[PDB]
Write a protein that binds this ligand. Structure first.
Ligand SMILES: *[C@@H]1O[C@H](CO)[C@@H](O[C@@H]2O[C@H](CO)[C@@H](O)[C@H](O)[C@H]2NC(C)=O)[C@H](O)[C@H]1NC(C)=O
Ligand code: NAG
Ligand code: NAG
Ligand code: NAG
Ligand code: NAG
Ligand code: NAG
Ligand code: NAG
Ligand code: NAG
Lengths: 101, 256, 360, 50
């Protein structure tokens, strides 16, 4: 499934400016109650594109188990959560995908 | 706050040819139309009630039968409405008709009516009419039908779900209260009530004394009962019922 | 064809009936007033919690289902037992409007045969529910940045709710064996929990306002009937008239009859309608039925000639070699001022003969 | 769900007439233009036989 409207409304995908300071680390946030955000200071590079795919994979993983109870809203183990983003980082980096887009 | 204040005496008089109403809303001009409906019979026994409050329970609840003819020569402020129902308590639905100086409120709820209900003016309070009103299913507020020597006639019917009220105001020259001649009662309201009505009671207004809590008063009214009867009504050039014959009164009227 | 013969003897034969066909349909239904208060329920500034769901009875008005259709934000307009298309014509005795606010994920639970927290403990519909459910997003009215803590729901209850039942009790839910004694803690939880609505929630959790319309019929006459369209009035023509459920076909001419204010229709000596009052504008019209006539064919013998003349009995010549007689309109015969003996009788002193066909 | 019925149609059918046309119905004032959506529903619905 595609992204929610609140994801596009509430995520800050660009560095805000000098006046407002923010953490530049790429982080995917599952705030709860169907609210999913990405904190990313995007630069126009291939690396930020792959990192955006990784964090959107994190957000999709968080999005899929929303029907589960709150204390079970995590990966089955600690490897799965990063693995499902790293497979997107693998697939997006292929020459075929770059020729496609 | 139910208090017993009204005592009532009764006499018997003659209806003459009073009580005729328009049986439908169809214009008929210069014709003789025979209709079978609930009518007050000609020269029938009508009970004249005098209700007196002086400053025990002696104001019983009257039956409704198939409909009631009501008449009064009193002013518009003394008699202020009526109560209709079967048990007159919270277990069955009931209809309350209350008139005041500005409008009339007709309202069907589950009223827990008092044994001697009366509207008291002080503003007007209905706490002496009933003690509670729950599960209320109908309300209708409209222009009043007790306005201003003047004889006021009403016909109440409860037919197949609808409560029909017919009224007329006739200026009677000083004399006998029930006059001769004809004055047909125009249809006033048809209310989609759909309740069972077997008993009724008249509402009077009492004033506070401000000095035997209520001022002494008297009210005279005539009550007759409608019966399934066939009438022959005369419609004149302008559509008004100016005359009628009661088909079962005497052999001459039967021939007519 | 009428005489069932190929040879017709000289004379006048009544063969058909002329009629004036109805041209338009005029459905002057009762004037549309006192529309049902759907603005009070749908456009209320404050809705109710789902545990204390608001119920409003609707009676003695005209139920307008077009305002509902006009509103765009509706997420569900799902109807049960009656079609949405035939809402305006089929009519009922009482209409119950139940209003509450829930979360988006639970909107599927407002249906017959469904299970969940809302269906079992807050609002239950029967399996034979006849009515409609309407839901729409209410972020701009019910979401607060600090959190809207004024919407509550029942999470715990001993038994499931019956259809159309409410529970406003605040008793502590006793889930174990020990008595709660009115104080919360372990195995004793308060059943009413707050719907803390915030504008940044996901679509399954945004506040949705739900109105459930339940229609019921009883032995009483049904009085919540949807408004019937009242088309324009056309006079002086043969139009099918439907005035306040009284139907017919006839010309509606101006009337000199002064009706009394309580009268609606008018009748003849022989109890046939001759007048009516328009329910939109308080005017009196003389209903006169459209012209009809006995078509008679005047012909000599087929041995002599095949020329025919047509007499429309009782019909004026302007409503159908055209001559006007007291018998009716004669078409196909030429009036001659000469007088002869009667050959084919027409009526009122008029006779027809063949010499062409002449009338005299 | 193999058995379907025509819930919505513009007009009633004739005797011994079969309608198998899977075209959309316009249930409101707004035209649907052949695409499902708000107040635009498919005429043929399946029975939930259990
Ligand atoms: C006459 O009766 C009417 C009907 O109840 C009274 O009008 C109402 O007054 C109340 C005040 O408590 C208002 O809330 C309502 O809106 C009024 N209704 C209408 C239809 O106007 C009126 O006050 C009464 N007059 C007297 C002198 O008692
Ligand atoms: C997601 O896809 C659905 C249909 O697949 C569409 O209706 C919706 O608008 C899309 N959302 C966004 C944010 O593009
Ligand atoms: C009216 O009824 C009373 C008793 O109910 C009776 O005594 C009286 O004679 C009656 N009057 C007439 C005119 O019948
Ligand atoms: C009438 O009221 C009582 C309590 O006031 C209630 O228990 C009962 O169900 C009500 N009945 C109807 C028909 O509203
Ligand atoms: C109306 O009430 C009376 C008295 O309570 C009763 O005898 C009668 O059967 C009732 N009518 C109906 C239709 O229930
Ligand atoms: C009927 O109406 C006409 C015209 O308004 C009027 O002149 C006449 O007095 C009325 N009454 C009767 C009995 O004709
Ligand atoms: C609510 O308000 C809107 C405002 O445009 C209006 O169009 C509508 O008729 C109102 N009522 C309902 C039931 O939506
Ligand atoms: C009938 O409808 C018209 C429409 O303009 C309105 O003006 C009028 O008040 C309505 N009522 C009556 C009694 O004519």
């Amino acid at each position: 499934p595609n992204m929610t409207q609140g994801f596009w409304e509430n995520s800050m995908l660009t560095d805000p400016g000098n006046v407002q300071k923010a953490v530049c680390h790429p982080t995917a946030w599952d705030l709860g109650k169907g609210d999913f955000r990405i904190l990313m200071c995007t630069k126009v590079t291939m690396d930020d594109f792959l990192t955006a795919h990784h964090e959107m994979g994190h957000i999709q993983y968080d999005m899929a188990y929303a029907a589960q109870p709150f204390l079970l809203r995590n990966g089955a183990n600690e490897g799965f959560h990063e693995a499902v983003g790293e497979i997107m980082s693998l697939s997006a980096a292929t020459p075929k995908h770059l020729k496609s887009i | 706050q139910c208090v017993n204040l009204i005592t009532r005496t009764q006499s018997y008089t003659n209806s003459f040819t009073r009580g005729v109403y328009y049986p439908d809303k169809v214009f008929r001009s210069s014709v003789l139309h025979s209709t079978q409906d609930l009518f007050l019979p000609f020269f029938s026994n009508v009970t004249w009630f005098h209700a007196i409050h002086v400053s025990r329970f002696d104001n019983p609840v009257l039956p409704f039968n198939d409909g009631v003819y009501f008449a009064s020569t009193e002013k518009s402020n003394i008699i202020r409405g009526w109560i209709f129902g079967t048990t007159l308590d919270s277990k069955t639905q009931s209809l309350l008709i209350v008139n005041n100086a500005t409008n009339v409120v007709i309202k069907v709820c589950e009223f827990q009516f008092c044994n001697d209900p009366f509207l008291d003016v002080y503003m007007e309070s209905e706490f002496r009419v009933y003690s509670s009103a729950n599960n209320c299913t109908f309300e209708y507020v409209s222009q009043p039908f007790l306005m201003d020597k003047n004889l006021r006639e009403f016909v109440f019917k409860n037919i197949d779900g609808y409560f029909k009220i017919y009224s007329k105001h006739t200026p009677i020259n000083l004399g006998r209260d029930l006059p001769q001649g004809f004055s047909a009662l125009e249809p006033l309201v048809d209310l989609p009530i759909g309740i069972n009505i077997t008993r009724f009671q008249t509402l009077l207004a009492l004033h506070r004394s401000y000095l035997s809590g209520w001022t002494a008063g008297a009210a005279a009214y005539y009550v007759g009962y409608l019966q399934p009867r066939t009438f022959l009504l005369k419609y004149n050039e302008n559509g008004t019922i100016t005359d009628a014959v009661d088909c079962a009164l005497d052999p001459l009227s039967e021939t007519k | 064809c009428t005489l069932k013969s190929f040879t017709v003897e000289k004379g006048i034969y009544q063969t058909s009936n002329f009629r004036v066909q109805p041209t338009e349909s005029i459905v002057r239904f009762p004037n549309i007033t006192n529309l049902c208060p759907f603005d009070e329920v749908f456009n209320a500034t404050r809705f109710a919690s789902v545990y204390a769901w608001n119920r409003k009875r609707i009676s003695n008005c005209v139920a307008d289902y077009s305002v509902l259709y006009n509103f765009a934000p509706f997420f569900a307009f799902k109807c049960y037992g009656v079609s949405p298309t035939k809402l305006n014509d089929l009519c009922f005795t009482n209409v119950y409007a139940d209003s509450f606010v829930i979360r988006g994920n639970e909107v599927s639970q407002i249906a017959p045969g469904q299970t969940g927290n809302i269906a079992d403990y807050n609002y239950k519909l029967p399996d034979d529910f006849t009515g409609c459910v309407i839901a729409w997003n209410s972020n701009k009215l019910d979401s607060k940045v600090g959190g809207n803590y004024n919407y509550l729901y029942r999470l715990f209850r001993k038994s499931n709710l019956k259809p159309f039942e409410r529970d406003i009790s605040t008793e502590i839910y006793q889930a174990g064996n020990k008595p709660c004694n009115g104080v919360a803690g372990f195995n004793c939880y308060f059943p009413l929990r707050s719907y803390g609505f915030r504008p940044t929630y996901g679509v399954g959790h945004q506040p949705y306002r739900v109105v459930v319309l339940s229609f019921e019929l009883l032995h009483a006459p049904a009085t919540v009937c949807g408004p019937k369209k009242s088309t324009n009035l056309v006079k002086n023509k043969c139009v099918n008239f439907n005035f306040n459920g009284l139907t017919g076909t006839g010309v509606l001419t101006e009337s000199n009859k002064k009706f009394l204010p309580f009268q609606q229709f008018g009748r003849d000596i022989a109890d046939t309608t001759d007048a009516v009052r328009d329910p939109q504008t308080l005017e009196i019209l003389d209903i006169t039925p459209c012209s009809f006539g006995g078509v008679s064919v005047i012909t000599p013998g087929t041995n002599t000639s095949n020329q025919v003349a047509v007499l429309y009995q009782g019909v004026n010549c302007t409503e159908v070699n055209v001559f006007q007689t007291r018998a009716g309109c004669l078409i196909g015969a030429e009036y001659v001022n000469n007088s002869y003996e009667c050959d084919i009788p027409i009526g009122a002193g008029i006779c027809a003969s063949y010499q062409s066909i002449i009338a005299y």
